[PDB]
């Protein structure tokens, strides 16, 4: 009689689901926070299902206490009107009986695609067919999961954005319907089914003023809009054409306040659509979080440069007068006149008049953006095989080397490409998708790394205290054309700085094709950035920069050169202190194309948090925009047609390195971050009072708190020990604790990068090493070996020094004595094959002392 | 379970014309008549009064989870 | 191999030793010998 | 100095392609003078190039001596691959090479 | 510019491959495009048997320096 009772008058077509009348415990997500424990876990919680075949729809019911049934009843009976609440039922010891849900809830969802696990994730492939999103042979094409192959995953994904947004304005209804029913409380994604419905009030409080938490519900579910394409039904007329936006439309700031009123509108924090309006970078961020999501919806023509025709002696020219980002929103100049060496330099690096005055293109070759041509026939280019070493080899195999079965094996060569492979390369760039953060656990990683860079000091500089190194380097496209940055800086340029922070002054970069050893054949390419960036990038960051160069003992080791004995100092400082010393590491696959344009934007913002004193608070953001419009978004002229890059690293600017580092301790954070707050804290008391303040700290308080951030840093130098170089990384982490889930897992980072960086990193690709007197298996291209002199000492792969003396391009004995310096460690390792390879080096050398080489490992 | 705002604060007494204690400085809520500004010395403006006779003062620039503790204490 | 191949659609006895090797650091000297003629 | 010459003499012959009349109107058409910068082309380009894969691409979207893209009508005038190709030749598809060049012109 | 082919000359012959040896003796019959894995030859040939279907000879008359082809 239950189940006829639990359906009264609506389809009681129900099969059960659980045994009886009982309960039925799942292993399902929630979001706790009372008192004793907060995170974002998975908890062991009378489920029936609808039969149509059966169909996705559950008829929840629940037991609780009678102070609780009266508590939901009354807002409930208070909030039936909304169409966006769940028809609920009641009746009776209490049973609240729900109707019409779905098998999981949003919560659910999020979990999944945030903690994604190809060894159990039957929950996302339930939730992927369930929706008709694919069918369900789709997943014995293994590897399917991954984004760098299989793209087709994101065309399956996309199959959830209706179910999303209609998510997105079900729950805006019913803030609304709350607000004016004078109802109080917080929203939790796990109160919300797939469909769209809500239940659960049992924490809510009793008209015209109510006001609901709904911070960690939007902040918790933003990654999975920019997935799913939820906003991707916004550029219909309302199924429908396209719509037909005017062409000459920049704007679009009354369509942003109104998506945002469409579905964020109880976001109680001030919205900027042009970030020039923030009040500090953590208000930058958290408005260009927003302007990620809704630049997808306007036409792709809009953003760019916005050009204004001037005039100077009765020629009219086309110039930039503005910039339209897809995250810092429209920003006009200041110092702009319309009537008239530096104005040539800005001049010239504009884009404007080259798009402009060049031809129409369509490259149907790639899928990125065309701009337009600059010449009448595009070009090829090619890149030439290897320069054979006949006498270096016939040495060699008169040492008795390159037997059958040896160690030693040549895998490293110069690889030849063939005409269309730069266009193939670039095309690489598909890698990168729009993404959102969550912003709230974002604004305590920035915080958390700005503690990790508290060491260092530094500001803005004149021209006469920057130094300048390499000065025959690419310049830029309109530059190279004529000389180097040689050339440039032997001519001028303080002034020019104080304009770059006043103004936007967009530039082009060459992205050409490098010729180097490698053990895979693809292709690999070197950008120059303009020298209008570089020149202002130095001024903005090199103290900063050459401080964290400098300094010894720090999280960072850029810098750090491994001779005299460097690399032992490095691994004792890595080894500062830990109770259960392991070791670890990691690798990010498609690092430069692939990671998002907010945690780029965050790192320069973060390298920026030296200029309280120096700079303004405009002054900053003018610099934040110039850098993001002249090494995230900038214009790329591959071959002879200009192209607009989405996004990615510059490889060629000088801030890659420092910048890559703060991206990689933001990740190795963020993955603390989620393993302790996913851990299940009812299951020690110190790690759980932490854990509850920082769930407090992010989802909670609304401003910074220095005294956790403090605590929170030290609690990882101790149990959570690392040591970063752009995109290499090593740990020294207590095993116990990862084993409890107390700092980050290797899972964890897999997670963290699937969910935010839209790759997947293969559990090959990383190592873990138990004993210290071996040290870590690879960090910088490079191995270590416990010798006796008891010290550690760095040696390479002699398949890769052996390659690198074989084939030695045109254009002598340094590169010899240089492999013979890093090869001198090979000479302790217990293999002797591996021995033989410095000494035939030494015996190569003397036919053009091993002290020499020694004196180069002990510390003094 | 996500709780609006477990051990909830207590009442205080302030000068005119509900507190947070937070050990990194004072920080009062709400003062639970038209009282345009009130002192405590820092000038703490408040709101229109909210009529349920007593009557509630929040502080303009107060966000939605403030209020939420303001409110459920009372 | 490819490029032997690719870079002559665009440009007879290295393609056979190319594609017929055990060892790998014979052909990369056949493709030098193309390009430079 | 020599950069300083070389930079503007690049500025001058550079607008004489700009063509002042069609791109007077398309500016002056705007609110405030303001134009995204990649319309420019888009709509005040005397010459389109468009470069093909294979023979597939070429059925869908040059079939013919005319062809229309940008909301407007384009006739071709020249081909080219990796020397000119006759639009005969292309059907055979595997004697010619992939990266055809089809430039055009916009028809009034 | 004599270098390169001198070298490359002296490692072939020091590669010693019957396959490449036929081939290279044989120039000193040449073939007038890529050998596949049809073949047209100015039958035995690199180590392999191929399977003649048309002749043809200088005036490109079929006939039942000549060119030869064969699968
Ligand atoms: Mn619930
Ligand atoms: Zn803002
Ligand atoms: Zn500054």
Same mark, same amino acid.
């Given at each position: 009689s239950f189940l006829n009772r639990v359906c009264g008058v609506s389809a009681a077509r129900l099969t059960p689901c659980g045994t009886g009348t009982s309960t039925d415990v799942v292993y399902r997500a929630f979001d706790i926070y009372n008192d004793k424990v907060a995170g974002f876990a998975k908890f062991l919680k009378c *489920?029936?299902?609808?039969?149509?075949?059966?169909?996705?729809?559950?008829?929840? $019911?629940?037991?609780?206490?009678?102070?609780?049934?009266? =508590?939901? !009843?009354?807002?409930?009976?208070?909030?039936?009107?909304?169409?966006? +609440? /769940?028809?609920?039922?009641?009746?009776?010891?209490? =049973?609240?009986?729900?109707?019409?849900?779905?098998?999981?809830?949003?919560?659910?969802?999020?979990?999944?695609?945030?903690?994604?696990?190809?060894?159990?994730? &039957?929950?996302?492939?339930e939730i992927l067919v369930t929706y008709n999103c694919c069918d369900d042979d789709y997943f014995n094409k293994k590897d399917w999961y991954d984004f760098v192959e299989n793209?087709?995953?994101?065309?399956?994904?996309?199959?959830?954005? !209706? *179910?999303?947004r209609q998510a997105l304005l079900k729950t805006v209804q019913f803030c609304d319907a709350m607000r004016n029913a004078g109802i109080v409380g917080v929203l939790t994604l796990d109160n919300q089914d797939l469909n769209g419905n809500w239940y659960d009030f049992g924490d809510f409080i009793q008209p015209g003023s109510g006001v609901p938490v709904v911070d960690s519900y939007y902040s918790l579910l933003m990654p999975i809009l920019t997935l799913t394409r939820a906003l991707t039904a916004e550029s219909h007329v309302d199924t429908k054409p396209y719509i037909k936006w005017d062409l000459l439309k920049y704007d679009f700031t009354e369509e942003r306040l109104k998506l945002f009123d469409r579905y964020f509108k109880y976001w109680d924090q001030t919205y900027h659509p042009n970030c020039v309006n923030c009040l500090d970078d953590r208000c930058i961020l958290h408005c260009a979080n927003?302007?990620?999501?809704?630049?997808?919806?306007?036409?792709?023509?809009?953003?760019?440069?916005?050009?204004?025709?001037?005039? +100077?002696?009765?020629?009219?020219?086309?110039?930039?007068?503005?910039?339209?980002? *897809? %995250?810092?929103?429209? +920003? =006009?100049?200041? &110092? +702009?006149?319309?009537?008239?060496?530096? %104005?040539?330099?800005?001049?010239?690096? &504009?884009?404007?008049?080259?798009?402009?005055?060049?031809?129409?293109?369509?490259?149907?070759?790639?899928?990125?953006?065309s701009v337009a041509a600059l010449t009448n026939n595009v070009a090829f280019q090619t890149?030439?095989?290897?320069?054979?070493?006949? &006498?270096?080899?016939?040495?060699?195999?008169?040492?008795?080397?390159?037997?059958?079965?040896?160690?030693? %094996? #040549?895998?490293?060569?110069?690889?030849?490409?063939d005409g269309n492979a730069a266009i193939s390369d670039y095309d690489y760039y598909r890698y990168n998708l729009p993404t959102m953060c969550d912003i709230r656990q974002l604004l305590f990683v920035v915080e958390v790394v700005d503690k990790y860079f508290d060491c260092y000091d530094g500001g803005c500089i004149n021209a006469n205290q920057v130094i300048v190194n390499n000065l025959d380097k690419s310049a830029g496209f309109p530059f190279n054309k004529w000389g180097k940055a040689r050339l440039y800086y032997d001519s001028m340029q303080d002034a020019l700085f104080a304009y770059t922070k006043r103004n936007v002054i967009p530039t082009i970069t060459q992205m050409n094709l490098k010729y180097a050893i490698s053990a895979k054949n693809r292709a690999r390419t070197v950008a120059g950035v303009s020298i209008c960036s570089t020149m202002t990038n130095r001024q903005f960051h090199q103290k900063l920069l050459k401080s964290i160069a400098a300094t010894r003992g720090a999280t960072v080791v850029i810098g750090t050169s491994k001779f005299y004995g460097g690399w032992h100092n490095m691994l004792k400082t890595v080894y500062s202190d830990v109770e259960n010393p392991h070791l670890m590491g990691w690798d990010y696959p498609k690092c430069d194309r692939a990671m998002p344009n907010m945690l780029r934007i965050m790192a320069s913002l973060v390298? /920026?948090?030296?200029?309280?004193?120096?700079?303004?608070?405009?002054?900053?953001?003018?610099?934040?925009?110039? %850098?993001?419009?002249? $090494? #995230?978004?900038?214009?790329?002229?591959?071959?002879?047609? #200009?192209?607009?890059?989405?996004?990615?690293?510059?490889?060629?600017?000088?801030?890659?390195?420092?910048?890559?580092?703060?991206?990689?301790?933001?990740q190795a954070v963020t993955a603390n971050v989620n393993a302790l707050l996913s851990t299940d804290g009812n299951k020690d008391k110190y790690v759980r009072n932490l854990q509850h303040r920082l769930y407090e700290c992010l989802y909670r308080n609304r401003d910074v708190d220095t005294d956790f951030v403090n605590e929170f840093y030290a609690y990882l130098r101790k149990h959570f020990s690392m040591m970063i170089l752009s995109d290499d990384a090593v740990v020294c982490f207590n095993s116990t604790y990862a084993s409890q889930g107390l700092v980050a897992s290797i899972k964890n980072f897999k997670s963290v990068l699937y969910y935010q960086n839209n790759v997947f990193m293969s559990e090959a690709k990383c190592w873990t090493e138990t004993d210290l007197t071996k040290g870590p298996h690879e960090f910088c291209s490079q191995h270590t070996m416990l010798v006796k002199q008891y010290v550690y000492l760095p040696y390479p792969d002699p398949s890769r020094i052996l390659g690198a003396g074989c084939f030695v391009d045109d254009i002598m004995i340094e590169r010899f004595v240089s492999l013979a310096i890093d090869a001198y460690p090979l000479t302790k390792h217990p293999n002797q094959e591996y021995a033989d390879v410095f000494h035939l080096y030494l015996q190569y050398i003397r036919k053009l002392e091993p002290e020499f080489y020694e004196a180069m490992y002990t510390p003094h | 379970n996500n709780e609006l705002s477990p051990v909830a604060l207590r009442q205080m007494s302030c000068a005119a014309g509900y507190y947070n204690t937070t050990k990194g400085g004072r920080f009062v809520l709400a003062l639970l008549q038209d009282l345009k500004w009130a002192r405590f010395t820092i000038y703490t403006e408040l709101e229109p009064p909210c009529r349920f006779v007593k009557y509630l003062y929040f502080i303009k620039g107060l966000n939605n989870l403030n209020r939420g503790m303001v409110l459920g204490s009372l | 191999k490819c490029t032997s191949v690719v870079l002559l659609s665009v440009?007879?006895?290295?393609?056979?030793?190319?594609?017929? /090797?055990?060892?790998?650091?014979?052909?990369?000297?056949?493709?030098?010998?193309?390009?430079?003629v | 100095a020599k950069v300083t010459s070389a930079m503007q003499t690049m500025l001058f012959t550079m607008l004489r392609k700009l063509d002042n009349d069609a791109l007077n109107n398309i500016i002056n058409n705007a609110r405030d003078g303001c134009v995204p910068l990649n319309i420019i082309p888009l709509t005040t380009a005397a010459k389109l190039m468009v470069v093909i894969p294979d023979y597939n691409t070429y059925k869908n979207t040059c079939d013919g001596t005319t062809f229309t893209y940008a909301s407007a009508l384009w006739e071709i005038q020249q081909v080219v691959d990796a020397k000119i190709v006759q639009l005969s030749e292309i059907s055979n598809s595997p004697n010619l090479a992939w990266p055809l060049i089809v430039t055009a012109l916009r028809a009034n």
């Open positions: *489920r029936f299902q609808e039969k149509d075949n059966l169909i996705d729809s559950y008829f929840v $019911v629940k037991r609780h206490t009678f102070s609780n049934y009266q =508590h939901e !009843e009354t807002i409930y009976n208070l909030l039936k009107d909304c169409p966006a +609440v /769940a028809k609920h039922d009641f009746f009776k010891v209490p =049973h609240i009986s729900r109707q019409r849900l779905t098998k999981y809830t949003m919560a659910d969802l999020v979990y999944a695609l945030r903690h994604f696990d190809e060894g159990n994730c &039957d929950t996302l492939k793209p087709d995953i994101l065309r399956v994904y996309a199959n959830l954005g !209706e *179910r999303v927003f302007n990620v999501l809704f630049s997808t919806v306007f036409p792709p023509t809009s953003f760019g440069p916005l050009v204004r025709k001037i005039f +100077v002696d009765g020629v009219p020219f086309v110039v930039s007068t503005g910039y339209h980002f *897809r %995250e810092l929103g429209v +920003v =006009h100049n200041q &110092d +702009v006149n319309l009537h008239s060496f530096k %104005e040539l330099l800005v001049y010239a690096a &504009d884009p404007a008049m080259h798009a402009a005055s060049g031809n129409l293109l369509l490259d149907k070759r790639t899928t990125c953006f890149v030439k095989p290897g320069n054979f070493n006949k &006498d270096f080899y016939d040495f060699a195999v008169s040492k008795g080397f390159f037997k059958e079965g040896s160690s030693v %094996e #040549l895998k490293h060569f110069f690889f030849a490409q390298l /920026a948090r030296k200029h309280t004193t120096c700079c303004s608070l405009s002054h900053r953001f003018y610099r934040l925009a110039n %850098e993001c419009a002249q $090494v #995230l978004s900038e214009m790329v002229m591959c071959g002879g047609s #200009l192209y607009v890059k989405p996004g990615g690293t510059s490889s060629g600017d000088a801030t890659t390195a420092y910048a890559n580092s703060v991206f990689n301790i933001c | - | 440009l007879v006895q290295l393609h056979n030793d190319i594609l017929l /090797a055990k060892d790998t650091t014979e052909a990369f000297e056949k493709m030098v010998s193309l390009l430079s | -």
